[PDB]
Amino acid sequence: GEIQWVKPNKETGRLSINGPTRTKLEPSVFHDVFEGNKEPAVLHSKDPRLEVDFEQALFSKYVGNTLYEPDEYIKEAALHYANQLKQLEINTSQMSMEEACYGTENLEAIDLHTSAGYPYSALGIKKRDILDPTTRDVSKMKFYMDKYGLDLPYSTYVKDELRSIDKIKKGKSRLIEASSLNDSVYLRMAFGHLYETFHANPGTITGSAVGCNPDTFWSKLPILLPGSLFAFDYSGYDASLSPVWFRALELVLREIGYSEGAISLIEGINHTHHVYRNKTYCVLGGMPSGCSGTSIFNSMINNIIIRALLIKTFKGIDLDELNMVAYGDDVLASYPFPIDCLELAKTGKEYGLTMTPADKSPCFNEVNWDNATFLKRGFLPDEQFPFLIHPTMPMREIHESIRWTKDARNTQDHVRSLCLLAWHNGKQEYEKFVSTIRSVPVGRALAIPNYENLRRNWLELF
């Protein structure tokens, strides 16, 4: 990804958002009860805690594009993953508007709680004005789609979220880059069935863990990834993807039987316009970050990357014996024998992708289930039933999260949510958590769920 040009809104004629540049995250009742050092992210250019220029720090994620066109390694990788998909028999025919907007059993309805994007968010029009789940009416959508058309700019804004104190100083906030409701609807009409099958089939056929339920899916992973595991963290994955990866995704999409009309929508993702407050700019390469109607494609592209890195680093490596799942940038993969992570990372460097192995370290050793991280979570076999695997969210993260709130009226719900995460760390850990909560009068007034009861309901999921 790389910005091509920037122009002021006055020049382009694009509507300005505002924004309401103030954090909604306030310290919660447990702020000083628990330990942590994460504050709300930097929202405006004038933030007192800034070390650098904010606006230019924001866009330093676009490291540039190295390759524009698939070489022989990328094509072979795209074909293998394409071939592997075929067994899923993905329905390539356009999904109706009604289903794309209001949901099926394997595809969730468009979230009515997010902004509708350009120009709706700028015009005060929100999704509730257009969509109604009770009526399931699409005529008002077709109307607004008629009015504004497709290929609209992505309304871009800073994500109001907790960040490390280092990222606040260095000004590395994260952007929500939201597509226009119009393009969401159209994209989901073209690829809605693909999303459906993917959602319904987390695992090694799809190569995806998108929409999985870590509570149950965790136990399936050791079986789905036998032999020697490998994994790593990407640095700025989304913005580091060059147009080559979108080209390779087009190849994959064509090979599984998509029309050219549907396939031409991928260029609208590769080459994007954005509006950030009162300046508009053009991005070539790079996956738009904000929304989730982009998660599946990221996971697919990652399935291409991993394959393309393997066959380029190791002559005559066997792609039929690779197993992987990806949720965006996050990848868990395995192979019959171990793989040099530092050699992959240098092959990835050729394609403009920053990779550092998930450890210290500076590499794998060899990274198996004990230290294995996926979707932040670790993997812990159940004490009594070792074949059942707990997803372990690190207490470190849970502590950071409890110390802040966006709405003070939501302390009960927010805590329960964290408890549903916490207990997987074990009975000893959970007691220590709940007692620190009950270390304060407000905590003792709360309905904190019982350990063995939580375990009970978990067992009943198997």
Ligand X SMILES: O=c1[nH]c(=O)n([C@@H]2O[C@H](COP(=O)(O)OP(=O)(O)OP(=O)(O)O)[C@@H](O)[C@H]2O)cc1Br
Show binding-site residues: 163, 167, 174-175, 235-236, 238
Site string for Ni ion, 264-283 (x = CB under 5 A): ------------------x-
DSSP three-state, residue 165: helix
Tokens of 3: 């910005």
Residue 238 in the binding site for ligand X (CB under 6 A)? yes
Q: What residues are paired with 374 via a beta bridge?
A: 377
Beta carbons of 122 and 17 less than 8 angstroms apart: yes
The least distance separating Ni ion from the CB of residue 149, rounded to whole angstroms, comes to 16
Q: How far apart are CA 27 and CA 410, in angstroms?
A: 13
The least distance separating ligand X from the CB of residue 291, rounded to whole angstroms, comes to 8
Identify which of residues 108 and 166 has a Cβ nearer to ligand X in the complex. Answer: 166
Q: Which of residues 18-47 bind ligand X (CB under 6 A)?
A: none
The least distance separating ligand X from the CB of residue 202, rounded to whole angstroms, comes to 17
Among 203, 290, 293, 348, binds ligand X (CB under 6 A): 290
Identify which of residues 80 and 163 has a Cβ nearer to ligand X in the complex. Answer: 163
Among 202, 211, 236, 285, binds ligand X (CB under 6 A): 236
Considering CB distances under 5 to 8 angstroms, the limit depending on partner class, which of Ni ion, ligand X, none binds residue 238? ligand X
Identify which of residues 328 and 352 has a Cβ nearer to ligand X in the complex. Answer: 328
Tokens of 247: 């080209």
Identify which of residues 36 and 443 has a Cβ nearer to ligand X in the complex. Answer: 36
Among 237, 245, 351, 430, binds ligand X (CB under 6 A): 237
Residue 235 in the binding site for ligand X (CB under 6 A)? yes
The least distance separating Ni ion from the CB of residue 7, rounded to whole angstroms, comes to 10
Site string for ligand X, 145-184 (x = CB under 6 A): --------------x--------------xxx--------
Helix axes 411-422, 427-437, angle to 10 degrees: 160
Considering CB distances under 5 to 8 angstroms, the limit depending on partner class, which of Ni ion, ligand X, none binds residue 423? none
Site string for Ni ion, 159-188 (x = CB under 5 A): ------------------------------
Beta carbons of 310 and 39 less than 8 angstroms apart: no
Identify which of residues 159 and 432 has a Cβ nearer to ligand X in the complex. Answer: 159
Q: What residue is closest to Ni ion based on CB?
A: 282
The least distance separating Ni ion from the CB of residue 431, rounded to whole angstroms, comes to 56
Residue 63 in the binding site for ligand X (CB under 6 A)? no
Q: How many helices (H) and strands (E) does the chain have?
A: 21, 15
Longest distance between any two alpha carbons in the chain, whole Å = 66
Residue 288 in the binding site for ligand X (CB under 6 A)? no
Categorise residue 269: left if φ over 0, alpha if ψ from -120 to 50, beta otherwise: alpha
The least distance separating ligand X from the CB of residue 321, rounded to whole angstroms, comes to 28
Q: How far apart are CA 265 and CA 294, in angstroms?
A: 12
Identify which of residues 219 and 299 has a Cβ nearer to ligand X in the complex. Answer: 299
Residue 329 in the binding site for ligand X (CB under 6 A)? yes
Known binding residues for GTP: 163, 167, 174-175, 235-236, 238
Per DSSP, which regions of 311-353 are E strands? Answer: 323-327, 330-335
Q: How far apart are CA 110 and CA 138, in angstroms?
A: 13
The least distance separating Ni ion from the CB of residue 66, rounded to whole angstroms, comes to 19
Considering CB distances under 5 to 8 angstroms, the limit depending on partner class, which of ligand X, Ni ion, none binds residue 329? ligand X
The least distance separating Ni ion from the CB of residue 109, rounded to whole angstroms, comes to 31
Beta carbons of 117 and 14 less than 8 angstroms apart: no
Cα 8 to Cα 13, 204, 275, distances in angstroms: 9, 46, 9
Residue 3 in the binding site for Ni ion (CB under 5 A)? no
Considering CB distances under 5 to 8 angstroms, the limit depending on partner class, which of ligand X, Ni ion, none binds residue 282? Ni ion
Considering CB distances under 5 to 8 angstroms, the limit depending on partner class, which of ligand X, Ni ion, none binds residue 432? none
Residue 374 in the binding site for ligand X (CB under 6 A)? no
Beta carbons of 2 and 285 less than 8 angstroms apart: yes
Tokens of 18: 């505002």
Query: Any idea what DSSP says for residue 388?
Result: S
Identify which of residues 2 and 329 has a Cβ nearer to ligand X in the complex. Answer: 329
DSSP three-state, residue 2: strand
DSSP three-state, residue 234: strand
Alpha helical stretches, state H, 256-294: 260-263, 267-270
Helix axes 295-313, 181-200, angle to 10 degrees: 60
Cα 229 to Cα 107, 304, 310, 339, distances in angstroms: 31, 18, 14, 9
Identify the sign of the CA torsion 206, 208, 214, 219.
positive
Tokens 């993917």 sit on residue? 198
Residues contributing to the site for Ni ion (CB under 5 A): 282
Residues contributing to the site for ligand X (CB under 6 A): 159, 174-176, 233-238, 289-290, 328-329
